[PDB]
Design a binder for this molecule. Structure first.
Ligand code: NA
Ligand code: NA
Ligand code: NA
Ligand code: NA
Ligand code: NA
Ligand code: NA
Length: 150
């Protein structure tokens, strides 16, 4: 389903912060990569093994989200259908988030804090990437997003 531009930052356990484009290249040979993610049951950050990583959607349509966070404005470019986790109503398509939704932001490898939508706009198409993880989610540019497998 949803996918991310290649410059979106992933927090890996063994390669440090890494763009998702570079993760896809590394995962072609190294199948042991874990990424910072989130257990929605216990509400705890967890490391999640990657099970797949690819350029899924070439020249895909995109929005750019600006998210107000504890540390200032974070931006993410993702397909309009990419789901973003909210604490108030579960996963929400990027193009359906509102300023009432409560996003989950990793402010360090072991703490989270609420994020709030600042703005959303269409941007020009790009090749997009995604990964599959054991938690069906991961942090992208410190924002908790969904990782589909179908
Ligand atoms: Na995806
Ligand atoms: Na890296
Ligand atoms: Na290998
Ligand atoms: Na909730
Ligand atoms: Na919902
Ligand atoms: Na707008």
């Amino acid at each position: 389903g949803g996918a991310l531009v290649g410059s979106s930052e992933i927090i890996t356990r063994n390669y440090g912060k890494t763009t998702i484009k570079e993760v896809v290249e590394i995962f072609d040979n190294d199948k042991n990569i874990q990424v910072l993610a989130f257990n929605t049951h216990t509400d705890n950050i967890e490391w999640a093994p990657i099970k797949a990583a690819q350029l899924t959607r070439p020249n895909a349509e995109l929005v750019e989200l600006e998210i107000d966070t504890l540390h200032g404005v974070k931006t993410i470019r993702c397909t309009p259908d990419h789901p973003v986790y909210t604490k108030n109503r579960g996963y929400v398509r990027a193009d359906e988030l509102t300023d009432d939704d409560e996003l989950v932001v990793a402010i360090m490898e072991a703490k989270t804090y609420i994020g709030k939508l600042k703005s959303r706009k269409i941007v020009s198409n790009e090749d997009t990437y995604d990964i599959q993880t054991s938690t069906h989610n991961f942090f992208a540019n410190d924002i908790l997003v969904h990782a589909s497998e179908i």
